[PDB]
Design a protein around this nucleic acid. Structure first.
Lengths: 81, 404, 195, 124, 146, 49, 224
RNA sequence: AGCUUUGCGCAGUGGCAGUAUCGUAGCCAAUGAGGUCUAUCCGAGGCGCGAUUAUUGCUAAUU
RNA sequence: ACGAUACAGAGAAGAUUAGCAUGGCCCCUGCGCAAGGAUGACA
RNA sequence: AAGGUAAGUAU
RNA sequence: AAGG
């Protein structure tokens, strides 16, 4: 069950007509675009703080904000209670 | 420079299959997959790299003992007919010719809501069996077209249904009367009183085209698309000879009225006349192009006619072991070819030209074209009385013809 | 989303929604009372009020669909009978469908197109949507008969229409709805109104 | 092999001729793709012939087309591949049934008649 | 999503009916496969949207950029370029206190258009290059509506 | 997004006509069919405002 | 067993081939192997390209522009003509497309014409059969005119259409079919005053049955 | 022997529009994409994502 | 530890500019490729 | 009392 | 370059 390739002239089994045609007409522009995209997303510095840093910052905020957190309520900026 | 190498790389054909690409890369020794290398990058790397670089004996004896006396009796009958004055033979000849030219469409009955593939006359010429593609076989009264005993039939399209030669005459209605072939290869036996099959002959894993009894009524001949034809013995309830002589599928089988010979016409474009007494191909038909769809041994005992896709009906003479006349019958694929059952009075031909024609058996000249129908004439049969003609068609109707 | 985290987020959204609604209403009361406010706070308040009013309108439309028409048959019969008797007393002749060979057909189309263009008389820059709408107006003016044929086809067969955008003119006393209709339907509506 | 339910199966030469005619009909705006469009053409009696594939799984999803063809007196044939039939129709997706419509004055009339004659003498 | 659901379910029901009329797959294997396919398609339609990257603002740039000319550039220059009708409307006479011509918007004026001191005896003609035109896709939609 | 089932889109071009007609129905309900006919006058010679 | 291509597939192929050619030309130019392309100049483009040069030397610039245009036209004509089917090569393609392979089988059609006296009709049949490689025989009788035509299915269809519509007593197709091998040569138009020698001549080729059918059908028509 | 139809290339001349052209080892699709009108009727790509001076190159200036 | 002095000082704006070819769309013309249609011609 | 600092380089 |  070999069908002649309309794009290369070779013979492929009929189980691989559609995939051979889709791959055969794949623009190298797709390859260069994918390479560019890979370069961009693997080189940009992270903007927001990591998760552990976020947790530590929230812990410091809770320590220094007793009007929201904790049991006892000290002033807005104080940490003793 | 390297620009010309890049130009060469474009012209190189590389398989689009990932497994084939990996196999080719491993054959050259290069790593199959680099880090972060997908199938497209693998194909690109391959492109760059390529750019760089004992029952049979008993049955035969019984057939011979049944056939030799019949062949002899036919021989003395022919001798007596020769002794008959030539004026009487000529006179009955033009009487038959005038009777045939007066044929008209006697009746037209819808066999089923699907095309009718076969029609067969009962031995008493009072019942007609029609094989339909809907998987239903029906029995019709001959003098008046009305259904009298339907059959549950097969599941696929029914190829051919043939009455037992002794049916409706000698053997009881409850016994086997009919054999029908389907498009899945199944063969089922029938009785005139039971709609359900009496028995189900098996072994044909591939579609069987035609099924016809031996004239003795003891052996049933089946032709399969396995490049084979099989003979089924009713008494033994077991197939006898699965002969394999055709290069392609075997379509039609015709038996000798004497019972000594059997003729198989298949899609090989060639016919073979097997010997039922010895199981050897006595005579090999040759001359037809394309598949042969019809064959019938003449009651004379020495004439064979075959119909094929050549739009021709070749008549074969057994005495000379060669073709004698080629009848260019009809302008479409010829299917049904049949002589007068009693003697060689005439030849009836049917084709996909939605028409049927009648030819003098000796002279092979047209007498009356059974014009009519609106679909391809799949099959035809002539009653034992000889004045009844039935032609089923793709038109979902079968028609009767009698002289008026 | 696990059920405890989902419930936590639901409680957060409930509390934030309460605060959001109260802040929007308090800010709007300040706006109405004449409290000195900035443009950013007014824009945020207008957005919040649009969200709240549209949620209320969604609830109202859902209630109307669920509770059916609020006018009973008897009230509808009385109103319709009063209107019919008034129209018969005045011997009013119903306004027919605009004829294909209507004499004043082009004058009404010209008036409708001029009314549609009045929104750009003093404009200096054109939005893409404004550019497209004004191009439609120019095309309709260039070929009045094709535009009239399309208008008649819409009036005869068109029963489904595209969505309309809504905005609110932030008059400090109360919000005024502003509806944005598709330019293709706007020409038909304007001609129908004029006729 | 192929499903025996598709008894009017064309050979290689007729398969090539049928695919060529289907492509020409597509170029002439005289072809309908899909079993539903084939059924619509059969019901309206504007179908010259129906070409359907033998790889449809299950094949019973297009076995109603032969019945409609018999009812409407329209030739029908089975091709061995649903991927080549789709390609002939001009669509990358597989097509299991295509209908060649009737267009008066079409230059394909002679080829359509020849293909009809070839098909109608091949079913049995 | 109920229209697409109805279409897909109708197609699969037609397939099942065609199978059923021949009394095949009496167990329901074809029916179960079709129902599984329908459920998979429904789930795909209900699938949550994927994570989509936020596009940052482009960094301001001061380097020189070379832009091609030609027919396209000529047409864009003709369209966006200043027109005599607009060149004259940008000029306002000094000490010639005009009269208000638009109630709905004050300060609006035609400038030197059709006013003394413009220096032009004849009125400037309308530039046809600034004529309003509709989009190509919009033109396609209008053609389809016909 | 919501669909409008109750009430009118007052931003339509012809919404002015709908409002005036519906208000005329209101005036019929309020004035009645007799006082309104007296105010409007006979249809042959309608009264002024 | 060829595979056809969708219109989108064709567009993709053409686009990527043209893009590859353009990239190759740009690489050749940048690498120095090819000179950079000069701007295309027409009569309407003359001033826009060289207004400074057209002012000083109007006729010289006009001659240069016309020389460039004539060079482009000459290149187009040379490309077209270079790739042109020789006059004999045109016949070879035509002489081959009409030669069907009769190795598998030969299609035979038999026709019976009431009258075939016109020499122009005789020449038409002879020439049409000769061009279409339709070997056969024409036998002339008082009423029977057996026209056996053998060849390829396309030629058979064309020739059937010929006597059915192009050529006008009436023309009747006796029998159309196939045979394993050919049995007649080029058109001869044999004259057969009597039936016996016509049948004998048809028997010489082994195709007397065509004569039998034609004679029987003519007799039946006469009786009808 | 001419004539002529369809599709595919290759060029030449000319016209039009730059709110659009592409990319799809992403997904779905004649086993039906998508349906405001004509719905027991229509029949083909759609969506998501990416590229961009709303296709991309050279050339000439200033630099 | 500023400030005084001497110098610069437009202390707030990718202000860019043309030509051609590609690309899209729509014809027309020529040539090639693969198929086909209709018709004319005596001894 | 402010919302009124040119940003510099040298000595 | 000079100042506390």
């Amino acid at each position: 069950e070999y069908l002649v390739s309309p794009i290369t002239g070779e013979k492929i089994p009929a189980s691989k007509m559609q995939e051979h045609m889709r791959i055969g007409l794949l623009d190298p522009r797709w390859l260069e675009q994918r390479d560019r995209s890979i370069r961009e997303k693997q080189s940009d510095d992270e903007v927001y703080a990591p998760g552990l840093d976020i947790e530590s910052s929230l812990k410091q905020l809770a320590e220094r904000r007793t009007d929201i957190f904790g049991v006892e309520e000290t002033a807005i900026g104080k940490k003793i209670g | 420079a390297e620009f010309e190498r890049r130009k060469r790389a474009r012209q190189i054909n590389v398989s689009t299959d990932d497994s084939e690409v990996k196999a080719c890369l491993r054959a050259l020794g290069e790593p199959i997959t680099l880090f972060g290398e997908g199938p497209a990058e693998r194909r690109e790397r391959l492109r760059n790299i390529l750019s760089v670089v004992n029952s049979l004996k008993v049955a035969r004896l019984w057939i011979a003992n049944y056939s030799l006396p019949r062949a002899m009796k036919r021989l003395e009958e022919a001798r007596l007919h020769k002794e008959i004055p030539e004026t009487t033979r000529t006179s009955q000849m033009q009487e038959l010719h005038k009777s045939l030219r007066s044929l008209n469409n006697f009746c037209s009955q819808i066999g089923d809501d699907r095309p009718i593939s076969y029609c067969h006359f009962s031995p008493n010429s009072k019942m007609l069996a029609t094989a339909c593609w809907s998987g239903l076989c029906k029995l019709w009264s001959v003098p008046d077209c009305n259904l009298l005993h339907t059959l549950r039939g097969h599941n696929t399209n029914v190829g051919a249904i043939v009455f037992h030669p002794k049916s409706t005459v000698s053997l009881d209605p409850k016994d086997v009367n009919l054999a029908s072939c389907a498009a899945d290869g199944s063969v089922k036996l029938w009785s005139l009183d039971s709609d359900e099959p009496v028995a189900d002959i098996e072994g044909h894993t591939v579609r069987v085209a035609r099924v016809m009894w031996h004239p003795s009524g003891r052996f049933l001949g089946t032709t399969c698309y396995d490049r084979s034809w099989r003979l089924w013995d009713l008494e033994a309830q077991e197939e006898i000879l699965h002969q394999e002589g055709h290069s392609m599928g075997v379509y039609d089988i015709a038996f000798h009225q004497d019972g000594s010979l059997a003729g198989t016409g298949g899609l090989d474009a060639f016919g073979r006349v097997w010997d039922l007494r010895t199981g050897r191909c006595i005579m090999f038909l040759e001359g037809h192009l394309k598949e042969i769809y019809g064959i019938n041994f003449s009651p004379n005992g020495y004439h064979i006619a075959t119909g094929s896709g050549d739009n021709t009906c070749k008549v074969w003479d057994l005495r000379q072991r060669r073709c004698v006349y080629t009848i260019p019958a009809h302008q479409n694929l010829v299917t049904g070819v049949k002589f007068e059952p009693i003697h060689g009075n005439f030849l009836l031909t049917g084709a996909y030209d939605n028409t049927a024609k009648i030819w003098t058996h000796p002279g092979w000249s047209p007498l009356k074209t059974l014009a009519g129908h609106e679909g391809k004439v799949m099959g035809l049969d002539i009653s034992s009385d000889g004045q009844l003609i039935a032609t089923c068609s793709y038109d979902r109707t079968f028609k009767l013809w009698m002289a008026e | 989303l696990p059920t405890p985290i989902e419930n936590m987020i639901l409680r957060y959204v409930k509390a934030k929604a309460d605060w959001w609604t109260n802040t929007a209403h308090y800010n709007r009361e300040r706006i109405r009372r004449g409290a000195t406010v900035d443009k950013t706070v007014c824009k945020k308040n207008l957005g919040r009020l649009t969200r709240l009013y549209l949620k209320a309108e969604q609830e109202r439309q859902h209630n109307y669909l669920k509770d059916g028409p609020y006018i009973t048959a008897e009230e509808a019969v009385a109103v319709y009978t009063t209107t019919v008797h008034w129209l018969e007393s005045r011997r009013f002749s119903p306004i027919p469908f605009p004829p294909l060979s209507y004499k004043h057909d082009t004058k009404l189309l010209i008036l409708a197109l001029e009314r549609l263009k009045e929104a750009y008389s003093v404009k200096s820059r054109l939005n893409q949507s404004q550019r497209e709408e004004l191009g439609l107006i120019e095309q309709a003016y260039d070929n009045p008969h094709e535009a009239l044929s399309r208008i008649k086809r819409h009036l005869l067969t068109q029963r489904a229409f595209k969505e309309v955008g809504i905005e609110f003119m932030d008059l400090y006393s109360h919000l005024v709805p502003v509806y944005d209709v598709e330019p293709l339907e706007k020409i038909t509506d304007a001609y129908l109104d004029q006729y | 092999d192929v499903n025996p339910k598709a008894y009017p199966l064309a050979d290689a030469h007729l398969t090539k001729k049928l695919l060529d005619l289907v492509q020409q009909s597509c170029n002439y705006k005289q072809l309908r793709k899909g079993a539903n469009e084939a059924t619509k053409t059969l019901n309206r009696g504007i179908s010259e012939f129906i070409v359907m594939a033998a790889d449809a799984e299950p094949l019973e999803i297009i076995l109603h087309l032969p019945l409609l063809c018999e009812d409407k007196n329209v030739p029908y044939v089975f091709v061995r591949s649903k991927q080549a039939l789709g390609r002939a129709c001009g669509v990358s997706r597989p097509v299991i049934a295509c209908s060649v419509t009737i267009k008066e004055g079409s230059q394909l009339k002679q080829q359509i008649q020849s293909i009809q004659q070839s098909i109608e003498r091949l079913l049995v | 999503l109920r229209r697409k659901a109805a279409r897909l379910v109708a197609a699969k029901c037609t397939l099942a009916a065609r199978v059923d009329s021949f009394h095949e797959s009496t167990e329901g294997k074809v029916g179960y496969e079709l129902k599984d396919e329908i459920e998979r398609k429904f789930d795909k339609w209900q699938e949550p949207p994927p994570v989509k990257q936020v596009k940052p603002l482009p960094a301001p740039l001061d380097g020189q950029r070379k832009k091609r000319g030609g027919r396209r550039y000529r047409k864009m220059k003709e369209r966006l370029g200043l027109t005599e009708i607009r060149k004259q409307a940008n000029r306002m006479s000094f000490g010639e206190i005009e009269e208000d011509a638009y109630q709905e918007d004050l300060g609006f004026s035609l400038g030197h258009l059709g006013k003394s001191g413009s220096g032009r005896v004849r009125q400037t003609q309308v530039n046809e290059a600034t004529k309003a035109r509709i989009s190509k896709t919009l033109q396609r939609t209008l053609q389809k509506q016909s | 997004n919501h669909t409008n089932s109750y009430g009118i889109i007052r931003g339509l071009q012809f919404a002015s006509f709908i409002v005036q007609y519906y208000g005329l129905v209101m005036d019929l309900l309020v004035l009645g069919l007799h006082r309104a006919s007296e105010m409007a006058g006979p249809p042959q010679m309608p009264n002024d405002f | 067993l060829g595979v056809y291509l969708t219109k989108k597939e064709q567009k993709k192929l053409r686009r990527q081939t043209r893009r590859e050619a353009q990239k190759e030309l740009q690489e050749k130019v940048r690498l120095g192997l090819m000179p950079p392309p000069e701007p295309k100049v027409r009569i309407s483009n003359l001033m826009r390209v060289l207004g400074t040069e057209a002012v000083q030397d109007p006729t010289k610039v006009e001659a240069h522009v016309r020389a460039q245009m004539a060079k482009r036209q000459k290149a187009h004509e040379e490309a077209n003509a270079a790739r042109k089917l020789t006059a004999e090569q045109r016949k070879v393609k035509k002489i081959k497309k009409l030669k069907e392979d009769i190795s598998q089988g030969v299609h035979i059609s038999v026709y019976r014409v009431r009258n075939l006296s016109n020499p122009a009709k005789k020449f038409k049949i002879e020439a049409n059969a000769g061009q279409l490689y339709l070997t056969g025989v024409v036998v002339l009788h008082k009423d029977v005119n057996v026209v056996v035509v053998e060849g390829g299915p396309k030629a058979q269809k064309k020739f059937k259409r010929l006597m059915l519509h192009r050529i006008k007593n009436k023309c009747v197709l006796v029998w159309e079919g196939t045979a394993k091998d050919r049995s007649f040569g080029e058109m001869k138009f044999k004259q057969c005053p009597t039936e016996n020698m016509a049948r004998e001549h048809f028997k010489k080729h082994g195709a007397e049955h065509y004569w039998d059918l034609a004679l029987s059908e003519s007799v039946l028509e006469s009786t009808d």
